[PDB]
Amino acid sequence: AENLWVTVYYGVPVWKDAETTLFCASDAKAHNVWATHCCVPTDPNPQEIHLENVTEEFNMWKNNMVEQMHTDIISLWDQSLKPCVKLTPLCVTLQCTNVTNNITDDMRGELKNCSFNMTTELRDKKQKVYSLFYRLDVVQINNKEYRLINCNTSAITQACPKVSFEPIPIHYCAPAGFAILKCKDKKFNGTGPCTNVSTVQCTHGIKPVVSTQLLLNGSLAEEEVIIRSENITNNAKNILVQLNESVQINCTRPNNNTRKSIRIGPGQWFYATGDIIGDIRQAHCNVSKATWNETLGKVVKQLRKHFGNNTIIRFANSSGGDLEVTTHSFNCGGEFFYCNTSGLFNSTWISITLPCRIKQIINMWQRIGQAMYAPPIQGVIRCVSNITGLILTRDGGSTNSTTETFRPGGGDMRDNWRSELYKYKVVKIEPLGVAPTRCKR
Amino acid sequence: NCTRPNNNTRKSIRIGPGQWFYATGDIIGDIRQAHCNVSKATWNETLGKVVKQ
Amino acid sequence: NITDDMRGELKNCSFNMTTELRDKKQKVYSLFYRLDVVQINNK
Amino acid sequence: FLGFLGAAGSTMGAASMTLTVQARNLLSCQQHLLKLTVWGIKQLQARVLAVERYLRDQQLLGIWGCSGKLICCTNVPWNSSWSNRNLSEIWDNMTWLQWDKEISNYTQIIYGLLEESQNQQEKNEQDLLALD
Ligand SMILES: *[C@@H]1O[C@H](CO)[C@@H](O[C@@H]2O[C@H](CO)[C@@H](O[C@@H]3O[C@H](CO[C@H]4O[C@H](CO)[C@@H](O)[C@H](O)[C@@H]4O)[C@@H](O)[C@H](O[C@H]4O[C@H](CO)[C@@H](O)[C@H](O)[C@@H]4O[C@H]4O[C@H](CO)[C@@H](O)[C@H](O)[C@@H]4O)[C@@H]3O)[C@H](O)[C@H]2NC(C)=O)[C@H](O)[C@H]1NC(C)=O
Ligand SMILES: *[C@@H]1O[C@H](CO[C@@H]2O[C@@H](C)[C@@H](O)[C@@H](O)[C@@H]2O)[C@@H](O[C@@H]2O[C@H](CO)[C@@H](O)[C@H](O)[C@H]2NC(C)=O)[C@H](O)[C@H]1NC(C)=O
Ligand SMILES: *[C@@H]1O[C@H](CO)[C@@H](O[C@@H]2O[C@H](CO)[C@@H](O)[C@H](O)[C@H]2NC(C)=O)[C@H](O)[C@H]1NC(C)=O
Ligand SMILES: *[C@@H]1O[C@H](CO)[C@@H](O[C@@H]2O[C@H](CO)[C@@H](O)[C@H](O)[C@H]2NC(C)=O)[C@H](O)[C@H]1NC(C)=O
Ligand SMILES: *[C@@H]1O[C@H](CO)[C@@H](O[C@@H]2O[C@H](CO)[C@@H](O)[C@H](O)[C@H]2NC(C)=O)[C@H](O)[C@H]1NC(C)=O
Ligand SMILES: *[C@@H]1O[C@H](CO)[C@@H](O[C@@H]2O[C@H](CO)[C@@H](O)[C@H](O)[C@H]2NC(C)=O)[C@H](O)[C@H]1NC(C)=O
Ligand SMILES: *[C@@H]1O[C@H](CO)[C@@H](O[C@@H]2O[C@H](CO)[C@@H](O)[C@H](O)[C@H]2NC(C)=O)[C@H](O)[C@H]1NC(C)=O
Ligand SMILES: *[C@@H]1O[C@H](CO)[C@@H](O[C@@H]2O[C@H](CO)[C@@H](O)[C@H](O)[C@H]2NC(C)=O)[C@H](O)[C@H]1NC(C)=O
Ligand SMILES: *[C@@H]1O[C@H](CO)[C@@H](O)[C@H](O)[C@H]1NC(C)=O
Ligand SMILES: *[C@@H]1O[C@H](CO)[C@@H](O)[C@H](O)[C@H]1NC(C)=O
Ligand SMILES: *[C@@H]1O[C@H](CO)[C@@H](O)[C@H](O)[C@H]1NC(C)=O
Ligand SMILES: *[C@@H]1O[C@H](CO)[C@@H](O)[C@H](O)[C@H]1NC(C)=O
Ligand SMILES: *[C@@H]1O[C@H](CO)[C@@H](O)[C@H](O)[C@H]1NC(C)=O
Ligand SMILES: *[C@@H]1O[C@H](CO)[C@@H](O)[C@H](O)[C@H]1NC(C)=O
Ligand SMILES: *[C@@H]1O[C@H](CO)[C@@H](O)[C@H](O)[C@H]1NC(C)=O
Ligand SMILES: *[C@@H]1O[C@H](CO)[C@@H](O)[C@H](O)[C@H]1NC(C)=O
Ligand SMILES: *[C@@H]1O[C@H](CO)[C@@H](O)[C@H](O)[C@H]1NC(C)=O
Ligand SMILES: *[C@@H]1O[C@H](CO)[C@@H](O)[C@H](O)[C@H]1NC(C)=O
Ligand SMILES: *[C@@H]1O[C@H](CO)[C@@H](O)[C@H](O)[C@H]1NC(C)=O
Ligand SMILES: *[C@@H]1O[C@H](CO)[C@@H](O)[C@H](O)[C@H]1NC(C)=O
Ligand SMILES: *[C@@H]1O[C@H](CO)[C@@H](O)[C@H](O)[C@H]1NC(C)=O
Ligand SMILES: *[C@@H]1O[C@H](CO)[C@@H](O)[C@H](O)[C@H]1NC(C)=O
Ligand SMILES: *[C@@H]1O[C@H](CO)[C@@H](O)[C@H](O)[C@H]1NC(C)=O
Numbered sequence A: 001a002e003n004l005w006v007t008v009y010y011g012v013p014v015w016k017d018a019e020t021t022l023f024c025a026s027d028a029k030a031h032n033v034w035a036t037h038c039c040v041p042t043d044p045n046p047q048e049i050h051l052e053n054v055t056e057e058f059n060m061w062k063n064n065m066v067e068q069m070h071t072d073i074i075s076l077w078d079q080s081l082k083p084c085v086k087l088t089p090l091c092v093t094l095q096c097t098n099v100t101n102n103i104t105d106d107m108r109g110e111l112k113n114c115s116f117n118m119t120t121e122l123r124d125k126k127q128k129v130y131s132l133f134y135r136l137d138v139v140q141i142n143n144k145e146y147r148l149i150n151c152n153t154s155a156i157t158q159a160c161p162k163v164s165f166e167p168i169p170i171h172y173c174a175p176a177g178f179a180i181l182k183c184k185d186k187k188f189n190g191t192g193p194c195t196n197v198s199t200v201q202c203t204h205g206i207k208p209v210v211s212t213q214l215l216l217n218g219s220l221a222e223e224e225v226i227i228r229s230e231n232i233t234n235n236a237k238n239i240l241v242q243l244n245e246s247v248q249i250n251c252t253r254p255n256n257n258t259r260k261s262i263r264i265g266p267g268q269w270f271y272a273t274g275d276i277i278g279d280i281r282q283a284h285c286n287v288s289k290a291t292w293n294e295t296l297g298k299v300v301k302q303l304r305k306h307f308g309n310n311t312i313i314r315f316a317n318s319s320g321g322d323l324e325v326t327t328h329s330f331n332c333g334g335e336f337f338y339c340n341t342s343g344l345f346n347s348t349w350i351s352i353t354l355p356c357r358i359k360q361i362i363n364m365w366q367r368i369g370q371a372m373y374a375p376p377i378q379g380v381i382r383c384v385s386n387i388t389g390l391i392l393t394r395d396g397g398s399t400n401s402t403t404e405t406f407r408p409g410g411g412d413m414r415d416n417w418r419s420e421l422y423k424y425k426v427v428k429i430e431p432l433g434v435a436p437t438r439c440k441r
Numbered sequence B: 001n002c003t004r005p006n007n008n009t010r011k012s013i014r015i016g017p018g019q020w021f022y023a024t025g026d027i028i029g030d031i032r033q034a035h036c037n038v039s040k041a042t043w044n045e046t047l048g049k050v051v052k053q
Numbered sequence C: 001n002i003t004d005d006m007r008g009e010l011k012n013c014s015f016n017m018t019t020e021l022r023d024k025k026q027k028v029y030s031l032f033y034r035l036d037v038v039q040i041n042n043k
Numbered sequence D: 001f002l003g004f005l006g007a008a009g010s011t012m013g014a015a016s017m018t019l020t021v022q023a024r025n026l027l028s029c030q031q032h033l034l035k036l037t038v039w040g041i042k043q044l045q046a047r048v049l050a051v052e053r054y055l056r057d058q059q060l061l062g063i064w065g066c067s068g069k070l071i072c073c074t075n076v077p078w079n080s081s082w083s084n085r086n087l088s089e090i091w092d093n094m095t096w097l098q099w100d101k102e103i104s105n106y107t108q109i110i111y112g113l114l115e116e117s118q119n120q121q122e123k124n125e126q127d128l129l130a131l132d
């Protein structure tokens, strides 16, 4: 008997979960690939709005913003290499020796001096050239004859020696008709409701840093070490540990290198690794022992919280597989390091020097079919970075509560973005609605 | 009904780095000619219908 | 093992082609149908 | 962008005062897009969609006889079966998100009725002695 009449409202504050494409924006201030694909500037003072009395459900494991970074990053890598010189002509039988001059025993057998016959700019003329190679990229044919490691598998191209891939913070912004909501609540699990939310135009700046086992240069939690997982009980899943204190790691490549330019064709140059100046030493990373053996103690108390009150926690080494899986894949200065992390996970709870290997022909994790040759860096390099989180894998689940074993794990590229896109959700705005009122035309 | 009666196999030949060429290999058993079968009993009637029209 | 109707229809051809390495060659062979193979100026 | 969603936790009645805040925000390089013609398309698709969504809502307001208005009355009675609540339970102590969840299944029934009502109104305007 209410006698009401369906009035119509437009501009109603109602939203629904949705999937759309986000666009990148930058600080303007930033030959770097992300300085060109992230041209639109963000507002210097983002218009964040607190929403009073709003409860919203989040789930970081089903967040499509993560999938978009994966696609955008691999897409750019495959565009940047588009105009550059192919190294197909270098897939020739090589003649190699052992580079034994001024070598540290740790480097014995690591470098090879290889000579070969390759063409010049003229179709009818050849030249004899030589360069140094790392053993990881050179494979013996049937003791002096060697092939490049990927000749029976993939095409090889030279990375453009002009384009920087140094991470730049980028921001993702919503398209018209959409909005991004953020959790500002505390100690968020990564899933479930949060009751302290706000509306934003764009995400905070996120650096597209890619690494394995250890997560570098991210957001450093806030109040405590937080451990997140899709399931925790299921030993097939990863555990992401976010630290509230950073651990400084110092990595270096001690050998002083030079370069030589070899004509590979008309207007096409190949960049080869030249002689090492001075002694030949092994690449490595330094982690302060005084910080690491405390950082894990914090992790253990929080890790025990999910398994038991009086149980033993053991940190073991990594398992078998490719270097991309078993080691810490670290990209720094333009070269690719594969570091041994066993020295960091060798203890039971109840200065550390890590040796590294260097690889130049990179079959990027992203796909099989094409490989990239990374030109050498002149002089020497040093890297300073922040370990901000760990990826652990549970290697137990067995019927013995006495103890449980964790190992370095991960390796999925998305594990490096999921932890930053963690606080955000994309929604669509739907402006029409109806409701009864006591008024008719 | 059409058929190709020869039992073939294939061989993969490398033509370049990451590039394969697929070549026709040996024929297993007798070598016979490909052909199609049309039922005479239907064809010589189908045309009669066409002719009237 | 040829039916007379197939006599002259197939050819066994061998040739020199490259391998994955710029400096190496291999000898291979394959069968071809006569429609796709044309005589130069008898083997 | 001074409240794009500020009224989300407000009651349905209170939130009726921000309709221009939400509406004005729903229809907000150089060489890169043409050198790499993947991104030119990705960007255009986002822009075309924002326009199409805007226009579909405007067409409905047109058909229902509510063009140019943010608040519009109709002559379709409210069915008690769509929500058995009185006005003091709807306009106060309830948000628009909650209301939308409650009504959802009846959205198409209501929209169909709004279109029928406007057509009946037009028929009555082609008879100069109408409504007497
Ligand atoms: C986590 O976050 C940290 C912090 O941001 C980050 O570490 C930083 O990494 C970057 C890149 O690896 C480092 O930047 C390099 O620093 C060296 C140091 O040079 C110093 O001394 C020279 C002396 O004249 C000064 O001019 C210079 O300003 C410094 O004081 C620079 O030399 C590097 O620049 C060269 O390489 C660039 C690569 O694109 C070129 O664009 C640039 O023009 C320079 O190259 C030129 O000189 C070369 C010399 O041989 C020549 O070969 C080239 O052709 C060209 O002419 C660069 O600035 C930065 O310092 C790091 N920060 C710290 C504290 O170490 C971590 O990497 C990050 N972790 C991740 C991502 O995992
Ligand atoms: C209010 O609506 C009911 C019908 O709504 C029913 O539930 C809806 C979700 C949807 O499934 C409808 O199709 C359903 O019918 C009206 O009752 C109907 O009236 C017609 C009139 O002839 C009758 O034929 C139907 O059988 C009736 N439905 C039922 C279930 O009895 C009711 O009249 C509406 N009231 C007003 C004021 O509009
Ligand atoms: C790699 O091999 C090359 C030769 O194939 C070495 O270069 C020679 O070094 C001797 C040293 O006195 C010179 O006299 C020759 O003229 C050099 N030859 C050429 C073609 O440059 C090179 O030193 C070796 N590199 C290493 C690291 O052992
Ligand atoms: C939601 O989280 C924010 C955290 O950013 C809270 O804001 C803080 O509130 C305290 C209260 O005294 C202030 O001192 C801080 O300065 C505020 N932070 C900022 C960045 O301004 C906010 O109060 C929380 N809201 C709710 C409902 O808990
Ligand atoms: C983690 O995943 C496991 C595996 O599915 C879940 O445990 C199983 O849940 C099903 C539900 O029907 C049961 O039938 C199985 O017996 C459970 N397995 C075991 C070993 O008990 C588990 O609940 C998930 N846990 C979390 C926290 O998500
Ligand atoms: C990382 O370094 C450790 C030691 O520095 C390597 O461990 C050695 O592995 C061999 C393999 O059987 C053992 O015989 C040695 O006793 C191990 N040393 C120690 C101290 O346990 C480990 O293999 C290295 N990892 C990689 C990937 O090279
Ligand atoms: C969030 O909820 C609180 C109460 O649950 C709202 O506060 C009320 O605001 C009305 C406005 O006139 C007051 O009359 C009430 O006395 C307030 N209640 C209390 C307990 O103080 C608050 O406004 C809500 N936020 C929004 C955005 O509506
Ligand atoms: C509106 O639709 C939802 C489903 O989209 C209805 O909820 C379902 O109702 C059936 C009835 O047997 C249940 O079996 C489902 O489990 C319900 N789904 C959920 C998510 O609860 C809802 O009842 C409909 N509302 C009206 C008023 O008809
Ligand atoms: C050449 O390198 C191999 C690598 O295992 C090593 O065993 C061999 O002794 C080296 N030859 C010389 C002369 O050092
Ligand atoms: C270059 O070709 C000549 C041809 O006889 C060969 O003797 C020589 O060893 C080749 N050089 C290399 C480094 O393979
Ligand atoms: C290429 O040759 C190496 C030689 O050991 C082999 O292990 C590898 O599987 C080969 N790759 C392919 C694609 O056949
Ligand atoms: C590492 O952590 C310290 C801690 O305050 C911070 O100041 C520094 O900027 C961090 N470095 C990076 C690369 O984030
Ligand atoms: C990090 O979390 C631990 C948890 O107990 C806390 O004791 C420690 O003080 C925190 N560190 C910082 C910098 O807040
Ligand atoms: C945190 O995630 C774990 C893993 O599924 C879950 O069991 C736990 O209930 C979650 N906590 C909250 C507050 O949702
Ligand atoms: C690591 O510590 C050792 C200790 O002597 C030092 O010699 C080495 O240079 C350090 N490496 C780095 C990258 O600082
Ligand atoms: C890294 O290098 C800086 C240079 O001053 C040094 O202060 C710091 O202690 C080094 N870190 C480690 C882990 O050795
Ligand atoms: C585990 O230890 C913590 C330490 O404060 C305690 O609060 C908690 O109740 C303990 N849990 C059990 C099951 O005893
Ligand atoms: C683990 O620690 C023990 C402690 O003495 C040490 O002997 C062993 O070599 C360590 N393992 C690794 C891989 O460093
Ligand atoms: C080093 O790690 C062991 C692991 O059990 C721990 O007992 C010891 O207290 C740690 N050192 C420091 C200074 O805490
Ligand atoms: C490499 O050695 C040359 C030799 O003079 C020197 O000038 C150059 O600075 C060195 N580069 C380093 C240590 O980065
Ligand atoms: C066509 O008919 C002949 C009659 O003997 C038969 O041998 C042949 O297999 C048939 N072909 C097909 C395709 O059925
Ligand atoms: C085609 O093959 C089917 C197989 O059963 C056969 O029944 C049919 O009669 C054949 N058609 C002709 C035209 O021979
Ligand atoms: C080779 O093929 C030709 C095709 O006409 C044929 O005339 C000739 O007799 C064939 N040679 C043999 C040995 O059958």
Ligand SMILES: *[C@@H]1O[C@H](CO)[C@@H](O)[C@H](O)[C@H]1NC(C)=O
Residues within 6 Å of the ligand: C014, C015, C016, C027
């Ligand atoms: C391959 O090249 C050699 C070079 O003398 C030649 O004798 C041989 O007949 C060629 N093979 C073929 C099948 O053409």
